[PDB]
């Protein structure tokens, strides 16, 4: 009896107790989120607390089977993920400070309110308060007030916490043999022991920046064009060569530019494609929306939604008294139980999202054959890219025409193609410099390169230099502007949103070619191509059993993240942007500011 | 002369755990295999060696009605020359098996919202099960090189696991009520007959 064999049996017993306990926690989180009461809250804590104390126990029994004596990479991955210590490696005092800080920052953000200056009785939460201003208002001072207040009330409290948060999270990382907390966060993408498919944690920074260089021309043109249109909407405030003020970008931070479509639409006379009205005419309910969605995956050769799915899922808001969290999520409870929780109104937004979340479900059903610890996306950015390419194909005119939601008499003209690609680029392209820079600033804070007395300084220096965005009010080192964003004060890795973006277009271009689609990549609909669903499936069923480099190659035929598909999707907008910016200025200046 | 108690085995109130697969020996009675349908949602009727069509023809020395419960994914394992946790360690069928396999979904009866851990299977065993053997020992399974001393611990795992059937599970993780009909055929009078 060797130690690889004893590890086999140890995981075999784990794989069966883990499946049984993880289910009870999943069905306790389900019964709370669907039926929020003070009884469900207690049990979701209960079953989770047993699970968090079962994993913690099992972690210690696993350390006894050293990795170097295990040669089956499938076994190695399970042991490696089970031997994660995390906060355990910190002392019972420091492991308590960190969880006090994480709970304090999360509550300061999610419960953070700022109250009117003219009216110190009226206050506003981030939602549906200030975010309602950032999205729908086109006044300058109404936007500056919310932007500056949110970062000076919520931000200033989070600053001393984030300073301690950085210190402890580093100590946790350095104790688990990681350089810094950022290096710990880049371990998601690491690969070892598989020649031809290996990948070091430092290679992610090389990859992310190398690809971002190829993005820069497309972004500098979307930036310059958006600046020109913004300059015509806030005339006295915006320079023709300087960065965009951070409070005029459509949300609180500038993460997505989707809200600037009202100000930037190239051919506003021509209409947007909105099949919401057509769905109402034909008597469509949420039942139909997911049935049509289930039909889409069946067309490419993927299975039907499980018989349990329809019985147990929450496809409509129960409304009335029984309240819920309506945020759309796809639940892989395990043991064959799959569910979607979605408060679906009959619109086009929720039609596409049902395709998106059911895309997660199809991924979960595909890799369900795997061991418990290997039932997940190949890396973090895989799972969300799978859902997004479902809304990519389903939202096209071709798919909408072939289900009876768009008349075959509507004609796809080049001006609407530009209208489409821009509203995609505001969301998709505009977030890439915001995402890359933000995780760059966190990576460098953890690695030690940015001193505490420079945190906000090097932030807005990089906001000007990379994102092309400038602060409207100068900020000293008592602000924590990154902390005012959810993902930063709630301890989530953010680079996935950059990698997920590049991954999804790699998939879509590889699937559509296997479907023999001819034309621009943004017109493609993978429907009815079983060759495409086969190619996607052979990656979906892997889960974490294979390195993310091999899984990416089984779809696109390349071992590494690439950006050419993303540019190729946006190329028709790219040359049209090079045209409409003929006599505008492309690029920005890093020492312009609206505050003098 | 008398009907074989096919009512007993197929109806029952509780069936068995597969590791302690429960055999009813059927002899000297009239067999009426056509009644074998309880209108269950995922009914299976694979038969090997003998022909399932017109199964009320051939006499046999005995008819062993083996009954137990397993989850749907494992129902395919109840067949000649299979593998997996059920056929490896719990209930093996021979290569030249000459009987019938009759399963049906029972989520109605054996699930529980709190979880039903009464039905067990045998997760580990030191050797593969010979055809129609039964293991009911609770010997603490030694996996490592130190002896276990009849108490569970490191590399010393209890060899029986519970299914924990809940009504919210899936088709393959739901309890199915298998009934094997092993048709022995010896030099004997072969009393088990009946049109
Ligand atoms: C998680 O923590 C455990 C406990 O410290 C680590 O296992 C021990 O590491 C020390 C290092 O000096 C050894 O002396 C012990 O022999 C190890 N085993 C035990 C049972 O204490 C484990 O390596 C840590 N995991 C990671 C990934 O670093
Ligand atoms: C690793 O183990 C699995 C199942 O235990 C087996 O199917 C696979 O062949 C093994 N890998 C190697 C390289 O032997
Ligand atoms: C999916 O639905 C179709 C249409 O009813 C059906 O023919 C098919 O059998 C279903 N898939 C499976 C795996 O049963
Ligand atoms: C769900 O919550 C409602 C309260 O609105 C309660 O009446 C009902 O019993 C709850 N569900 C269950 C299964 O108890
Ligand atoms: C099974 O037994 C129960 C209780 O004795 C009885 O009500 C039922 O009719 C039986 N089912 C049959 C005979 O098919
Ligand atoms: Zn999603």
mmCIF file with all atom_site columns, C-alpha atoms in Angstrom, chain A residues 463-585:
data_model
loop_
_atom_site.group_PDB
_atom_site.id
_atom_site.type_symbol
_atom_site.label_atom_id
_atom_site.label_alt_id
_atom_site.label_comp_id
_atom_site.label_asym_id
_atom_site.label_entity_id
_atom_site.label_seq_id
_atom_site.pdbx_PDB_ins_code
_atom_site.Cartn_x
_atom_site.Cartn_y
_atom_site.Cartn_z
_atom_site.occupancy
_atom_site.B_iso_or_equiv
_atom_site.pdbx_formal_charge
_atom_site.auth_seq_id
_atom_site.auth_comp_id
_atom_site.auth_asym_id
_atom_site.auth_atom_id
_atom_site.pdbx_PDB_model_num
ATOM 1   C CA . UNK A 1 463 ? -6.347  56.007 -14.011 1.00 0.00 ? 463 UNK A CA 1
ATOM 2   C CA . UNK A 1 464 ? -5.031  58.839 -16.182 1.00 0.00 ? 464 UNK A CA 1
ATOM 3   C CA . UNK A 1 465 ? -2.312  56.782 -17.867 1.00 0.00 ? 465 UNK A CA 1
ATOM 4   C CA . UNK A 1 466 ? -4.089  53.466 -18.521 1.00 0.00 ? 466 UNK A CA 1
ATOM 5   C CA . UNK A 1 467 ? -7.858  53.938 -18.320 1.00 0.00 ? 467 UNK A CA 1
ATOM 6   C CA . UNK A 1 468 ? -7.716  57.470 -19.720 1.00 0.00 ? 468 UNK A CA 1
ATOM 7   C CA . UNK A 1 469 ? -9.950  58.761 -16.908 1.00 0.00 ? 469 UNK A CA 1
ATOM 8   C CA . UNK A 1 470 ? -9.317  61.613 -14.461 1.00 0.00 ? 470 UNK A CA 1
ATOM 9   C CA . UNK A 1 471 ? -10.687 62.509 -11.030 1.00 0.00 ? 471 UNK A CA 1
ATOM 10  C CA . UNK A 1 472 ? -12.860 65.652 -10.826 1.00 0.00 ? 472 UNK A CA 1
ATOM 11  C CA . UNK A 1 473 ? -11.695 66.436 -7.261  1.00 0.00 ? 473 UNK A CA 1
ATOM 12  C CA . UNK A 1 474 ? -8.113  65.910 -6.007  1.00 0.00 ? 474 UNK A CA 1
ATOM 13  C CA . UNK A 1 475 ? -7.827  63.186 -3.381  1.00 0.00 ? 475 UNK A CA 1
ATOM 14  C CA . UNK A 1 476 ? -5.301  62.785 -0.577  1.00 0.00 ? 476 UNK A CA 1
ATOM 15  C CA . UNK A 1 477 ? -4.335  59.497 1.082   1.00 0.00 ? 477 UNK A CA 1
ATOM 16  C CA . UNK A 1 478 ? -7.353  59.495 3.431   1.00 0.00 ? 478 UNK A CA 1
ATOM 17  C CA . UNK A 1 479 ? -9.568  58.242 0.591   1.00 0.00 ? 479 UNK A CA 1
ATOM 18  C CA . UNK A 1 480 ? -9.790  54.643 -0.587  1.00 0.00 ? 480 UNK A CA 1
ATOM 19  C CA . UNK A 1 481 ? -11.498 54.968 -3.965  1.00 0.00 ? 481 UNK A CA 1
ATOM 20  C CA . UNK A 1 482 ? -10.924 51.317 -5.029  1.00 0.00 ? 482 UNK A CA 1
ATOM 21  C CA . UNK A 1 483 ? -12.473 50.244 -1.717  1.00 0.00 ? 483 UNK A CA 1
ATOM 22  C CA . UNK A 1 484 ? -15.664 52.096 -2.689  1.00 0.00 ? 484 UNK A CA 1
ATOM 23  C CA . UNK A 1 485 ? -16.164 49.408 -5.356  1.00 0.00 ? 485 UNK A CA 1
ATOM 24  C CA . UNK A 1 486 ? -17.808 46.168 -4.247  1.00 0.00 ? 486 UNK A CA 1
ATOM 25  C CA . UNK A 1 487 ? -15.180 43.676 -5.416  1.00 0.00 ? 487 UNK A CA 1
ATOM 26  C CA . UNK A 1 488 ? -12.317 45.482 -3.654  1.00 0.00 ? 488 UNK A CA 1
ATOM 27  C CA . UNK A 1 489 ? -13.850 45.965 -0.191  1.00 0.00 ? 489 UNK A CA 1
ATOM 28  C CA . UNK A 1 490 ? -15.374 42.458 -0.326  1.00 0.00 ? 490 UNK A CA 1
ATOM 29  C CA . UNK A 1 491 ? -12.185 40.525 -1.213  1.00 0.00 ? 491 UNK A CA 1
ATOM 30  C CA . UNK A 1 492 ? -12.772 39.210 -4.736  1.00 0.00 ? 492 UNK A CA 1
ATOM 31  C CA . UNK A 1 493 ? -10.252 38.719 -7.525  1.00 0.00 ? 493 UNK A CA 1
ATOM 32  C CA . UNK A 1 494 ? -11.048 41.060 -10.411 1.00 0.00 ? 494 UNK A CA 1
ATOM 33  C CA . UNK A 1 495 ? -8.743  39.959 -13.256 1.00 0.00 ? 495 UNK A CA 1
ATOM 34  C CA . UNK A 1 496 ? -11.261 37.236 -14.143 1.00 0.00 ? 496 UNK A CA 1
ATOM 35  C CA . UNK A 1 497 ? -13.457 39.856 -15.833 1.00 0.00 ? 497 UNK A CA 1
ATOM 36  C CA . UNK A 1 498 ? -10.559 40.670 -18.171 1.00 0.00 ? 498 UNK A CA 1
ATOM 37  C CA . UNK A 1 499 ? -9.705  37.030 -18.906 1.00 0.00 ? 499 UNK A CA 1
ATOM 38  C CA . UNK A 1 500 ? -13.390 36.096 -19.206 1.00 0.00 ? 500 UNK A CA 1
ATOM 39  C CA . UNK A 1 501 ? -13.833 38.786 -21.862 1.00 0.00 ? 501 UNK A CA 1
ATOM 40  C CA . UNK A 1 502 ? -10.963 37.512 -24.012 1.00 0.00 ? 502 UNK A CA 1
ATOM 41  C CA . UNK A 1 503 ? -11.954 33.868 -23.462 1.00 0.00 ? 503 UNK A CA 1
ATOM 42  C CA . UNK A 1 504 ? -15.551 34.291 -24.629 1.00 0.00 ? 504 UNK A CA 1
ATOM 43  C CA . UNK A 1 505 ? -14.623 35.736 -28.027 1.00 0.00 ? 505 UNK A CA 1
ATOM 44  C CA . UNK A 1 506 ? -12.026 32.993 -28.503 1.00 0.00 ? 506 UNK A CA 1
ATOM 45  C CA . UNK A 1 507 ? -14.821 30.461 -27.975 1.00 0.00 ? 507 UNK A CA 1
ATOM 46  C CA . UNK A 1 508 ? -17.334 32.262 -30.185 1.00 0.00 ? 508 UNK A CA 1
ATOM 47  C CA . UNK A 1 509 ? -14.876 32.546 -33.069 1.00 0.00 ? 509 UNK A CA 1
ATOM 48  C CA . UNK A 1 510 ? -13.925 28.867 -32.729 1.00 0.00 ? 510 UNK A CA 1
ATOM 49  C CA . UNK A 1 511 ? -17.530 27.650 -32.469 1.00 0.00 ? 511 UNK A CA 1
ATOM 50  C CA . UNK A 1 512 ? -18.838 29.784 -35.340 1.00 0.00 ? 512 UNK A CA 1
ATOM 51  C CA . UNK A 1 513 ? -16.062 28.526 -37.621 1.00 0.00 ? 513 UNK A CA 1
ATOM 52  C CA . UNK A 1 514 ? -16.969 24.923 -36.782 1.00 0.00 ? 514 UNK A CA 1
ATOM 53  C CA . UNK A 1 515 ? -20.528 25.997 -37.670 1.00 0.00 ? 515 UNK A CA 1
ATOM 54  C CA . UNK A 1 516 ? -19.324 27.301 -41.074 1.00 0.00 ? 516 UNK A CA 1
ATOM 55  C CA . UNK A 1 517 ? -20.642 30.799 -40.399 1.00 0.00 ? 517 UNK A CA 1
ATOM 56  C CA . UNK A 1 518 ? -19.652 33.316 -43.077 1.00 0.00 ? 518 UNK A CA 1
ATOM 57  C CA . UNK A 1 519 ? -19.727 37.049 -42.442 1.00 0.00 ? 519 UNK A CA 1
ATOM 58  C CA . UNK A 1 520 ? -18.799 39.291 -39.519 1.00 0.00 ? 520 UNK A CA 1
ATOM 59  C CA . UNK A 1 521 ? -18.270 37.420 -36.262 1.00 0.00 ? 521 UNK A CA 1
ATOM 60  C CA . UNK A 1 522 ? -20.860 39.607 -34.502 1.00 0.00 ? 522 UNK A CA 1
ATOM 61  C CA . UNK A 1 523 ? -23.660 38.214 -36.709 1.00 0.00 ? 523 UNK A CA 1
ATOM 62  C CA . UNK A 1 524 ? -23.054 34.576 -35.806 1.00 0.00 ? 524 UNK A CA 1
ATOM 63  C CA . UNK A 1 525 ? -25.615 32.225 -34.270 1.00 0.00 ? 525 UNK A CA 1
ATOM 64  C CA . UNK A 1 526 ? -24.322 28.786 -33.238 1.00 0.00 ? 526 UNK A CA 1
ATOM 65  C CA . UNK A 1 527 ? -27.868 27.375 -33.291 1.00 0.00 ? 527 UNK A CA 1
ATOM 66  C CA . UNK A 1 528 ? -28.482 23.986 -34.970 1.00 0.00 ? 528 UNK A CA 1
ATOM 67  C CA . UNK A 1 529 ? -24.740 23.274 -35.406 1.00 0.00 ? 529 UNK A CA 1
ATOM 68  C CA . UNK A 1 530 ? -24.082 20.028 -33.542 1.00 0.00 ? 530 UNK A CA 1
ATOM 69  C CA . UNK A 1 531 ? -20.417 20.263 -34.551 1.00 0.00 ? 531 UNK A CA 1
ATOM 70  C CA . UNK A 1 532 ? -20.204 23.460 -32.487 1.00 0.00 ? 532 UNK A CA 1
ATOM 71  C CA . UNK A 1 533 ? -21.954 22.022 -29.432 1.00 0.00 ? 533 UNK A CA 1
ATOM 72  C CA . UNK A 1 534 ? -19.658 19.002 -29.614 1.00 0.00 ? 534 UNK A CA 1
ATOM 73  C CA . UNK A 1 535 ? -16.547 21.201 -29.610 1.00 0.00 ? 535 UNK A CA 1
ATOM 74  C CA . UNK A 1 536 ? -17.838 23.256 -26.677 1.00 0.00 ? 536 UNK A CA 1
ATOM 75  C CA . UNK A 1 537 ? -18.904 20.117 -24.790 1.00 0.00 ? 537 UNK A CA 1
ATOM 76  C CA . UNK A 1 538 ? -15.491 18.419 -24.890 1.00 0.00 ? 538 UNK A CA 1
ATOM 77  C CA . UNK A 1 539 ? -14.228 21.340 -22.787 1.00 0.00 ? 539 UNK A CA 1
ATOM 78  C CA . UNK A 1 540 ? -17.323 21.612 -20.577 1.00 0.00 ? 540 UNK A CA 1
ATOM 79  C CA . UNK A 1 541 ? -17.126 17.995 -19.394 1.00 0.00 ? 541 UNK A CA 1
ATOM 80  C CA . UNK A 1 542 ? -13.500 18.419 -18.269 1.00 0.00 ? 542 UNK A CA 1
ATOM 81  C CA . UNK A 1 543 ? -14.133 20.837 -15.425 1.00 0.00 ? 543 UNK A CA 1
ATOM 82  C CA . UNK A 1 544 ? -10.945 21.210 -13.390 1.00 0.00 ? 544 UNK A CA 1
ATOM 83  C CA . UNK A 1 545 ? -9.601  17.759 -14.333 1.00 0.00 ? 545 UNK A CA 1
ATOM 84  C CA . UNK A 1 546 ? -7.400  19.267 -17.062 1.00 0.00 ? 546 UNK A CA 1
ATOM 85  C CA . UNK A 1 547 ? -5.255  22.425 -16.991 1.00 0.00 ? 547 UNK A CA 1
ATOM 86  C CA . UNK A 1 548 ? -7.028  25.527 -18.258 1.00 0.00 ? 548 UNK A CA 1
ATOM 87  C CA . UNK A 1 549 ? -4.513  25.701 -21.116 1.00 0.00 ? 549 UNK A CA 1
ATOM 88  C CA . UNK A 1 550 ? -5.507  22.264 -22.439 1.00 0.00 ? 550 UNK A CA 1
ATOM 89  C CA . UNK A 1 551 ? -9.231  22.982 -22.049 1.00 0.00 ? 551 UNK A CA 1
ATOM 90  C CA . UNK A 1 552 ? -8.838  26.232 -23.992 1.00 0.00 ? 552 UNK A CA 1
ATOM 91  C CA . UNK A 1 553 ? -7.047  24.317 -26.763 1.00 0.00 ? 553 UNK A CA 1
ATOM 92  C CA . UNK A 1 554 ? -9.854  21.751 -27.082 1.00 0.00 ? 554 UNK A CA 1
ATOM 93  C CA . UNK A 1 555 ? -12.145 24.621 -28.182 1.00 0.00 ? 555 UNK A CA 1
ATOM 94  C CA . UNK A 1 556 ? -10.005 27.154 -30.069 1.00 0.00 ? 556 UNK A CA 1
ATOM 95  C CA . UNK A 1 557 ? -6.933  25.112 -31.016 1.00 0.00 ? 557 UNK A CA 1
ATOM 96  C CA . UNK A 1 558 ? -4.530  27.401 -29.136 1.00 0.00 ? 558 UNK A CA 1
ATOM 97  C CA . UNK A 1 559 ? -2.858  26.964 -25.760 1.00 0.00 ? 559 UNK A CA 1
ATOM 98  C CA . UNK A 1 560 ? -3.076  30.534 -24.457 1.00 0.00 ? 560 UNK A CA 1
ATOM 99  C CA . UNK A 1 561 ? -5.321  33.564 -24.058 1.00 0.00 ? 561 UNK A CA 1
ATOM 100 C CA . UNK A 1 562 ? -5.507  35.713 -27.195 1.00 0.00 ? 562 UNK A CA 1
ATOM 101 C CA . UNK A 1 563 ? -7.055  39.055 -28.101 1.00 0.00 ? 563 UNK A CA 1
ATOM 102 C CA . UNK A 1 564 ? -7.412  38.835 -31.909 1.00 0.00 ? 564 UNK A CA 1
ATOM 103 C CA . UNK A 1 565 ? -10.955 37.340 -31.661 1.00 0.00 ? 565 UNK A CA 1
ATOM 104 C CA . UNK A 1 566 ? -12.056 40.303 -29.522 1.00 0.00 ? 566 UNK A CA 1
ATOM 105 C CA . UNK A 1 567 ? -10.676 42.800 -32.046 1.00 0.00 ? 567 UNK A CA 1
ATOM 106 C CA . UNK A 1 568 ? -12.083 40.741 -34.927 1.00 0.00 ? 568 UNK A CA 1
ATOM 107 C CA . UNK A 1 569 ? -15.564 40.892 -33.392 1.00 0.00 ? 569 UNK A CA 1
ATOM 108 C CA . UNK A 1 570 ? -15.252 44.686 -33.054 1.00 0.00 ? 570 UNK A CA 1
ATOM 109 C CA . UNK A 1 571 ? -13.389 45.375 -36.317 1.00 0.00 ? 571 UNK A CA 1
ATOM 110 C CA . UNK A 1 572 ? -16.370 46.894 -38.233 1.00 0.00 ? 572 UNK A CA 1
ATOM 111 C CA . UNK A 1 573 ? -16.714 49.429 -35.417 1.00 0.00 ? 573 UNK A CA 1
ATOM 112 C CA . UNK A 1 574 ? -12.925 49.877 -35.363 1.00 0.00 ? 574 UNK A CA 1
ATOM 113 C CA . UNK A 1 575 ? -12.584 51.208 -38.916 1.00 0.00 ? 575 UNK A CA 1
ATOM 114 C CA . UNK A 1 576 ? -15.753 53.274 -38.483 1.00 0.00 ? 576 UNK A CA 1
ATOM 115 C CA . UNK A 1 577 ? -14.160 54.724 -35.340 1.00 0.00 ? 577 UNK A CA 1
ATOM 116 C CA . UNK A 1 578 ? -10.996 55.523 -37.300 1.00 0.00 ? 578 UNK A CA 1
ATOM 117 C CA . UNK A 1 579 ? -13.330 57.387 -39.676 1.00 0.00 ? 579 UNK A CA 1
ATOM 118 C CA . UNK A 1 580 ? -15.458 59.396 -37.228 1.00 0.00 ? 580 UNK A CA 1
ATOM 119 C CA . UNK A 1 581 ? -12.281 60.428 -35.363 1.00 0.00 ? 581 UNK A CA 1
ATOM 120 C CA . UNK A 1 582 ? -10.707 61.786 -38.573 1.00 0.00 ? 582 UNK A CA 1
ATOM 121 C CA . UNK A 1 583 ? -10.283 65.295 -37.147 1.00 0.00 ? 583 UNK A CA 1
ATOM 122 C CA . UNK A 1 584 ? -10.731 64.560 -33.443 1.00 0.00 ? 584 UNK A CA 1
ATOM 123 C CA . UNK A 1 585 ? -7.765  63.895 -31.153 1.00 0.00 ? 585 UNK A CA 1
#
